[PDB]
Design a protein around this ligand. Structure first.
Ligand code: HEM
Ligand SMILES: CC[C@H](C)C(=O)O[C@H]1CCC=C2C=C[C@H](C)[C@H](CC[C@@H](O)C[C@@H](O)CC(=O)O)[C@H]21
Length: 403
């Protein structure tokens, strides 16, 4: 019998790092803001496929971020690590979400982020220096794209960069984990590490956010010890994994559009605009749109019922032709305003301006010091991560003009 169904499987995997998976360009094109899909466990779910609708549902208080709910749309087995663990505030709803988030925000304001610019410039050129000096060829992942945000986020959290090999490895295993067993074991490695850091900080008040949370909120019983572990773990992995994939994918992508890059290299006033457009275009975290309805919601004559799962896929909504003229075209000159790569509403990405700062420093730095950077394999040979985790390559060999 024909095989066509009205709720395709979800998610799909990318095949060119900067293009929607075929199955996603479909859903984008169907009229209507909501489409049915089938998740890995045969349950059926709603995906939002339009910009204004995504924007409205992300602001709607009837869509919960509670991941311990049995109807939360888990997209992979690995997910049931985070489901059964104490929740960071990304899995909380108002009013709990606010009191937890408000403990971390002092370190992420525009004032604090702006003033970090000297220190971020120092880290980047530091790791380039070392990269360049060991000569081509280089894997831009392990030698640059990953170490740079790791170092920055550690100094912010107060995690010692000495232990960098341990937690980078445990973060890798946890984002890319394909089964539940591997994800839990990565989580328990990281949690056990962080629990010892907290005791160490109870003996000697540490620096960073984690030190301040130990010495203050934990000492007064306003946060559970195990909640602290989850919060620090969220910031640590998010601090690392996202900026690094942006760096690698923005590099693959900028090279396959060499006439916009040229113009980037020639007018550094455009860099903050190309950052926005890169964020819109690449949307590395389309999974981070998971919600469950706690009530019936009406959207343009379609009905989400209490208990249904809804995935706001910000990569599709960012390719909404009625907001971005020719949406599948990378245009560093376009106005990429109102994009959803960071989300919207109360869960809007806490670290977005740190992420903008890192990318804008990193790019300038790559254009000053390796203006002849190019890839050391053809793009068709890179292994892409699957659609069940954050978008990116795991390896990126590159080369340049040696001194
Ligand atoms: C670099 C590229 C990044 C992308 C594409 C990205 C994407 C996102 C998205 C889409 C959300 C929404 C989650 C939801 O609505 O359920 C989110 C939340 C969050 N992100 Fe980012 N993010 C990035 C960088 C960062 C960085 C550098 C940090 C460092 C701390 C960070 C920390 C967080 C936190 C704490 C939240 C949750 C805020 C809340 O739930 O109130 N992110 N991110
Ligand atoms: C199953 C793969 C992972 C967990 C995933 O797809 O999401 C992670 C992977 C790395 C990038 C991410 C970016 C956006 C969000 C912060 C997202 C939410 C997941 C979060 O729940 C991870 C837990 O480790 C945090 C905790 O439970 O303390 C997070």
């Amino acid at each position: 019998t024909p095989q066509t169904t009205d709720a395709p499987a979800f998610p799909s995997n990318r095949s060119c790092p900067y293009q929607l998976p075929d199955g996603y360009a479909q859903l984008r094109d169907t009229p209507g803001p909501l489409h049915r899909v089938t998740l890995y466990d045969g349950r059926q779910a709603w995906v939002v496929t339009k910009h204004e609708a995504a924007r409205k549902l992300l602001g709607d208080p009837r869509l919960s971020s509670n991941r311990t709910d049995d109807n939360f749309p888990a997209t992979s087995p690995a997910f049931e690590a985070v489901r059964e663990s104490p929740q960071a505030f990304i899995g909380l709803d108002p009013p709990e979400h606010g009191t937890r988030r408000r403990m971390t925000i002092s370190e992420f304001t525009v004032k604090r982020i702006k003033g970090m610019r000297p220190e971020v410039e120092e880290v980047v050129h530091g790791f380039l220096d070392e990269m360049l000096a060991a000569g081509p060829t280089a894997d831009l992942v392990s030698q640059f794209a990953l170490p740079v945000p790791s170092m920055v986020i550690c100094r912010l959290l107060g995690v010692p960069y000495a232990d960098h090999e341990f937690f980078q490895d445990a973060s890798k295993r946890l984002v890319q984990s394909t089964d539940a067993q591997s994800a839990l074991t990565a989580r328990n490695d990281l949690a056990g590490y962080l629990d010892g850091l907290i005791t160490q900080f109870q003996t000697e008040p540490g620096a960073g956010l984690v030190g301040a949370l130990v010495a203050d909120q934990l000492a007064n019983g306003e946060i559970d010890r195990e909640e602290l572990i989850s919060t620090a773990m969220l910031l640590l992995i998010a601090g690392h994994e996202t900026t690094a994939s942006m760096t690698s994918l923005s590099v693959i992508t900028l090279l396959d559009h060499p006439e916009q890059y040229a113009a980037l290299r020639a007018d550094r006033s455009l860099v903050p605009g190309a950052v926005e457009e890169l964020l819109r275009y690449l949307a590395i975290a389309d999974i981070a749109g998971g919600r469950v309805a706690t009530a019936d919601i009406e959207v343009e004559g379609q009905l989400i019922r209490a208990g249904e799962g809804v995935i706001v896929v910000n990569s599709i909504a960012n390719r909404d032709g009625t907001v971005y003229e020719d949406p599948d075209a990378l245009d560093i000159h376009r106005s990429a305003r109102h994009h959803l790569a960071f989300g919207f509403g109360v869960h809007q990405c806490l670290g977005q301006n740190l992420a903008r700062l890192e990318l804008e420093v990193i790019l300038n730095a790559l254009m000053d010091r390796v203006p002849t950077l190019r890839l050391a394999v053809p793009v068709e040979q890179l292994v892409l991560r699957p659609g069940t985790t954050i978008q990116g390559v795991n390896e990126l060999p590159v080369t340049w003009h040696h001194h």
